[PDB]
Amino acid sequence: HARSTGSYSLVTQQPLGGKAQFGGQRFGEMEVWALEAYGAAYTLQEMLTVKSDDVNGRTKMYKNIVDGNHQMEPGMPESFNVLLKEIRSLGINIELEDE
Amino acid sequence: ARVTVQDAVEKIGNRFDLVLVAARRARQMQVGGKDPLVPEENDKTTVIALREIEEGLINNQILDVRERQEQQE
Amino acid sequence: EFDAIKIALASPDMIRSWSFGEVKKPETINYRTFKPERDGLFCARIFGPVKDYECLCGKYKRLKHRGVICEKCGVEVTQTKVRRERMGHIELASPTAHIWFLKSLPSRIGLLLDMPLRDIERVLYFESYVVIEGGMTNLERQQILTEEQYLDALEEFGDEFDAKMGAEAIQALLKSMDLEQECEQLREELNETNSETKRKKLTKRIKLLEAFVQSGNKPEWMILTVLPVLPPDLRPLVPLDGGRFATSDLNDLYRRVINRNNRLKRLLDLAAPDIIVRNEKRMLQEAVDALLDNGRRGRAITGSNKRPLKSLADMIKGKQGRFRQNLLGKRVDYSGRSVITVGPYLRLHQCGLPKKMALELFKPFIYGKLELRGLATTIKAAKKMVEREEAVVWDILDEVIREHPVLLNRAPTLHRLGIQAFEPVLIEGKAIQLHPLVCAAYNADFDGDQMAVHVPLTLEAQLEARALMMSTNNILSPANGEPIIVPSQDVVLGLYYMTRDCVNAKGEGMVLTGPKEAERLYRSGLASLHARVKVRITEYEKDANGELVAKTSLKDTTVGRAILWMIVPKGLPYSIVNQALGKKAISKMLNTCYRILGLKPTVIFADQIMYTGFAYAARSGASVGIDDMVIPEKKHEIISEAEAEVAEIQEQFQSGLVTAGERYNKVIDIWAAANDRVSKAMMDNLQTETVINRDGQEEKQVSFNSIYMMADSGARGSAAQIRQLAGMRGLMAKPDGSIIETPITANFREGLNVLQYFISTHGARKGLADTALKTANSGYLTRRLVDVAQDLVVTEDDCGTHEGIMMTPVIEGGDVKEPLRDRVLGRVTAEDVLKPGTADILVPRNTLLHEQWCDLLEENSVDAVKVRSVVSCDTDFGVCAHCYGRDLARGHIINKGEAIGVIAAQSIGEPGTQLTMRSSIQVKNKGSIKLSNVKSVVNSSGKLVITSRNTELKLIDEFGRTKESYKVPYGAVLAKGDGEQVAGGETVANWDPHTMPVITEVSGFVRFTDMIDGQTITRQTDELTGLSSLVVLDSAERTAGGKDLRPALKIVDAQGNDVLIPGTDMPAQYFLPGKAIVQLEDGVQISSGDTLARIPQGGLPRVADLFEARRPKEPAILAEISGIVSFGKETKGKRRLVITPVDGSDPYEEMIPKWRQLNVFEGERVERGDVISDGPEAPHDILRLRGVHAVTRYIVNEVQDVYRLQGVKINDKHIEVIVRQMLRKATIVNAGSSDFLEGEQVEYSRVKIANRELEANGKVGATYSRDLLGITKASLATESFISAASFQETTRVLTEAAVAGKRDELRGLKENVIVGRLIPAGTGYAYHQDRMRRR
DNA sequence: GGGCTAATGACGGCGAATACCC
DNA sequence: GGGTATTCGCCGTGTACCTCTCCTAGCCC
RNA sequence: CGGAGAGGUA
Ligand SMILES: [Mg+2]
Ligand SMILES: [Zn+2]
Ligand SMILES: [Zn+2]
């Protein structure tokens, strides 16, 4: 069972899980630790941002791969913004800062 | 046709300047222009860039001189 | 793009700035149409449009009207993404106590008001009152009341006094409090008051207060006034397959809250009596409690049946909250997974892959090459083409694979060989073929494991994969330099069969000019595979400066071994192959190949090993039959005689000679002895089974029986498992753990009964459950260790320091367990190595050491090597390069950047599956005698006794080093002395441990000096002889009068004057404890060293307790200060011990629970950090007394003893850097010329870069004290808080970071993983060099 | 049948909260 | 007072799959 | 496209 670009999930713009719902694998937590253990960084950055979460980066990635380029555009993971809207949905002020 | 990148690290011992130098050169050879200075074996520009690393004629300095001169032109 | 993440407290103005409407009505949808309901949770005019760029009434479906809101229904026409971005709010009639500040423990409003939490809960839940500005009354300011007391306050002070109830009164309390006056008052009381609990609570209160004034917050913001609501898309309304809606419980919670608030407004419209609105506001406070954190207050509300529901704290806490579910581990596109299979013909730089999965994964690449070739210009017809799988697409797929790596990944990723990279080769079928040797790295058999593929997209990631994470780049392991390409089971069997010497076969006793004709003979069949034959080989030694020299001769060898010689590359000698080639042998073959010939000969040598091993294992035919296990015929007689012996011991019990437990122990020893007899018998009858002719009569050799080869190769199993397949399987334990008295006599080649099989079923199920829960605690240990050494990245190249720890090989009191070479190997020296040819600069003082230098060290016989360590590294925000030395799994030094904390945590917690969970010395070797911490005297016999407690015996060999070391107690009986020589096995070290000595320093008369008879002592008469002894009893059984009448034994001379001890002017008074048996009586002169009284008397959770650094169940306490010792006040709970320094100040005392068998006397002068009562050694006292280097030496030797007892080796560097991240914090002693507070706890690097420059100018630095926190604790108190939000809790961390306003600068891995930028570890560390060089 | 329709079988640690002698 | 001396809750719990069902049911129209 | 609950895979 595998996947190239299928349905994204609703509460978080993330790939789904399972074979029945046509989803993909889970790059788990210890696998992030494994990539950190190697000196590789770009693999992880396109992993949990471009290939997984950020909608603008992955649509421009799709256009770049069909247009011959190999280039990421990081932006911001959407799930981070979901986390921030939940913590801001508490009684907590948390923001982003200077250039 | 490439199995080990040992000699590439023998020419640049830092092993992370390897990645940045090879990626910068292979980006500048991928999308357009600035033709590879090695014969190719019908292989992608990744292997071409590492092969030109192991010929010694690519490092940070050659890219510095050539990008600076393309800026001057 | 941006920088540090700021956090603060919610202000009502900030809430109203955030929101874009008030939800006044608790509706959700229309549920008759699919349109949303106005001003409910799913509101358009508050949040936004359902569909993209379409108004609700349908006015402006055109993009030309972007921005303008409607007027028929008032909808801001934009995208629907704004319904993911706009929050909302609920105006509240009642102010509301936020729940986290109520019940965080420590409660922030709790200790902020200087008020107990019970009264706060009684105020908030409307069952009490509180005083707001009493003034000139009979009522205190913080005072709480009840209803009749409220009637009293109505009686006497219905005028000017005022008081309220509920959260509004708490808001009035927070508004009615100055902070600067509280600061002055608490600082004065810190200067004045002298009580420890008062000092503790006041210093926490003043830390919170002056941190809060530093913060830009107001305390009444801790009381909620307007409730901010989540966007609707994050709480979305999903319908199931049917006519219902099973959504999140957040919508039900907000529905409850809005109904409760609107009915409270309506009951503030009808002006109800106040008891009903007490209940109503209590319900609203309960509702906000359940919205924020359900279950934190008592019995929790529910949804479906009785099941407690999910809230915001459930969304952020726990496992399945967003950090461990959706941030650190994200599902990723371009992924796949299948069952693994082999395909042995592959090389290790490649893996097999199914065609259909490759056509699934690489779809955009295939699209790109399709419209590059222009067979279809558009993309939809291209997608139909790749759906059809036509004739051209497979050639395109073979184009796009050829040099593109992929990542392979077994799911339980323990350590960093859980993920590698491979170049795919397209294989028919549907399962991933995988190179076999690499399976031993994954610990992945072919039982049905499902490995997953990922595909790197970008060009940098392809270079990372091919350049770092390739299989070729990883042939050594970051555990240690054992190569992980050790072959597993079949190929090692084939090699061990291919190099062995049968005594005679075809071709035995001829000569051959080359291995080529040896292979030509074996493929002919005109010879043996293996026969001792003189052939010619040729080897290539590079003894000169990297230059090949070819030599040759005739060597005696075996023929298959000669065939194997055509595989080894040039530089290896011949003697690597001339042995039997077991698993350890072929592993060190690959190790020497890597150490001599670089990398590419080692990789191609591994490929050729695998090919030839599979080929000649197929040529072997190493099968197994039932006659391949030989039962010894002695076993019938051995079990018969064992049965006779246990009948004899049983009838000796039934006569009444022995006890039951003595019978149990003697019977179980004779069973173990018979078991070892069976073991010796079966091992002989296997390993010399081959008794055959030699071309003469008869000769024995090692046997070609099958299971002896499968055990002697080390392929699978050992003497335990082959013992169970032939001999008896010994003894098994019961579920209580008591070893079973009637052992398992039978064996698996014979039958088993019901009962012994049942007993082994008990044992096997115990083993399986222990492996399950052991993997559980192993996973939790790995998680703690990756979040305690999260932050640490090597950042510099040298720190230029001279300090370092000392390296000696490890000895407990047995063999030298791990020698000096392996601990020294790969680490960079601190100071120069001095050979005992004293003042020979053997190596320079700050250089790397590899294996040739280690042979130079070993043959020069160096005993102690001073070396740099990571805990003593002096790097600002990181660790220098040369304190880390060789990056293991590679040859050279660590590069600038490659982060070690993660490989350290993985290489510690990885073998946790492989772990377990639940007198007199005969000195061995021969050498001269050395003593450490020596103080001795000769007794009356002439023997040598030791007058110091902490004396160690070292055995110098004939070389000069220390090969034996023993812990000698105070007063042992040595037959020899120091400066002398003992023989191999000559008994010298002997003592009586059951009796503590009263051995005398001097000689003289023993009077009865301060010995009161009848009140302090008693007279016990030995019944066996009659020559009795005085018996001093304890402090509580006797009267309290003789408690201060101390027992003493004082030495006087022939004139009766006090014998003067040389060294002082003090006489020889000897004090005694309670429960002693005092030996001598009056009129006898003693010798020096004479007894004056007969004094009477671990697994994986051990590792977890060490890294937590817990106090044990009975902590061995130590001396806190140097000087003479003295006793104190008797039994005010404990017995107090006061050490007075000779020159310093005395007043420290240490209470001792005196039920312990103590060690020190009353008249002893000890160093600080010296033992008082023995037992397990507590780490914190070792740090605050002995030093940093001693405590890191203790932890590394203990945990190396554990991991080496299980036989899986871990190098010390990983443990040491974990120890460094344990004690990252510090505690301030004095402020000095800086501005830190006295009791302020603050991390070591911060105060180090503070006081480093404060000494660099004219000012003076400050004094600190490193305290040794546990792993889970020092993760929390960090510069970041987002790491601690990822680790183990959320409530405590976010309350602390809330009241701090702690500006969270990123600085580390996982923080930069959450925000999704580059990791400042590798290539990202060069990137962050660039970006930090910008600012 | 249906259209609204608004309890109890963990367990170790650990630190904060009181109790209770002295 | 106050220093231990308990007790009273808080909190953690191995990773990654796959298969299946069942989801708000209440209730006076 | 969400969450429970049950079984199995390593
Ligand atoms: Mg398995
Ligand atoms: Zn409209
Ligand atoms: Zn250093």
From Swiss-Prot, chain A:
Record note on biotechnological use: Co-administration of salinamide and rifampicin or salinamide and myxopyronin suppresses the emergence of resistance to both antibiotics.
Transmembrane segments: none
Post-translational modification: Acetylated on several lysine residues in the presence of glucose.
Role, per record: DNA-dependent RNA polymerase (RNAP) catalyzes the transcription of DNA into RNA using the four ribonucleoside triphosphates as substrates.
Family stated for the protein in its record: Belongs to the RNA polymerase beta chain family.
Subunit structure: The RNAP catalytic core consists of 2 alpha, 1 beta, 1 beta' and 1 omega subunit. When a sigma factor is associated with the core the holoenzyme is formed, which can initiate transcription. The rRNA transcription and antitermination complex (rrnTAC) consists of RNAP, NusA, NusB, NusE (rpsJ), NusG, SubB, ribosomal protein S4, DNA and precursor rRNA; S4 is more flexible than other subunits. In pull-down experiments interacts with CedA. (Microbial infection) Interacts (via flap domain) with Escherichia phage lambda antitermination protein Q; this interaction renders bacterial RNAP resistant to transcription pausing and allows it to read through termination signals.
Protein name: DNA-directed RNA polymerase subunit beta
Gene that this polypeptide is encoded by: rpoB
Full protein segment contained here: 1244 to 1342 of 1342
Curated annotation (Swiss-Prot), chain B:
Coiled coil ranges: none
GO molecular function: bacterial-type RNA polymerase core enzyme binding; DNA binding; DNA-directed RNA polymerase activity
GO biological process: bacterial-type flagellum assembly; bacterial-type flagellum-dependent cell motility; cell motility; cellular response to cell envelope stress; DNA-templated transcription initiation; intracellular iron ion homeostasis; nitrate assimilation; protein-containing complex assembly
Keyword Oxidoreductase in annotation: no
Superkingdom of origin: Bacteria
EC number: 2.7.7.6
Catalytic activity as recorded in UniProt: RNA(n) + a ribonucleoside 5'-triphosphate = RNA(n+1) + diphosphate
An example Gene Ontology CC term for this record: cytosol
Keywords, ordered alphabetically: DNA-directed RNA polymerase, Nucleotidyltransferase, Transcription, Transferase
Family listed: Belongs to the RNA polymerase subunit omega family.
Subunit and interaction comment: The RNAP catalytic core consists of 2 alpha, 1 beta, 1 beta' and 1 omega subunit. When a sigma factor is associated with the core the holoenzyme is formed, which can initiate transcription. The rRNA transcription and antitermination complex (rrnTAC) consists of RNAP, NusA, NusB, NusE (rpsJ), NusG, SubB, ribosomal protein S4, DNA and precursor rRNA; S4 is more flexible than other subunits.
Chain's role: Promotes RNA polymerase (RNAP) assembly. Latches the N- and C-terminal regions of the beta' subunit thereby facilitating its interaction with the beta and alpha subunits. Part of the processive rRNA transcription and antitermination complex (rrnTAC). The complex forms an RNA-chaperone ring around the RNA exit tunnel of RNAP. It supports rapid transcription and antitermination of rRNA operons, cotranscriptional rRNA folding, and annealing of distal rRNA regions to allow correct ribosome biogenesis.
UniProt name for this protein: DNA-directed RNA polymerase subunit omega
Species this chain originates from: Escherichia coli (strain K12)
Gene this protein is translated from: rpoZ
Range within the parent protein: 2 to 74 of 91
UniProtKB/Swiss-Prot annotation, chain C:
Result for mutant: R723 to C/H/P/S: Resistant to antibiotics salinamide A and B
Post-translational modifications: Acetylated on several lysine residues in the presence of glucose.
Documented effect of changing Q489P: Resistant to antibiotics salinamide A and B
Co-factor binding details: Binds 1 Mg(2+) ion per subunit.
Outcome when changing G767 to A/C: Resistant to antibiotics salinamide A and B
PANTHER family hit by this protein: DNA-DIRECTED RNA POLYMERASE (PTHR19376), DNA-DIRECTED RNA POLYMERASE SUBUNIT BETA (PTHR19376:SF54)
Function in brief: DNA-dependent RNA polymerase (RNAP) catalyzes the transcription of DNA into RNA using the four ribonucleoside triphosphates as substrates.
NCBIfam families the UniProt entry points to: rpoC_TIGR (TIGR02386)
Name of the protein this chain belongs to: DNA-directed RNA polymerase subunit beta'
Protein source organism: Escherichia coli (strain K12)
Gene: rpoC
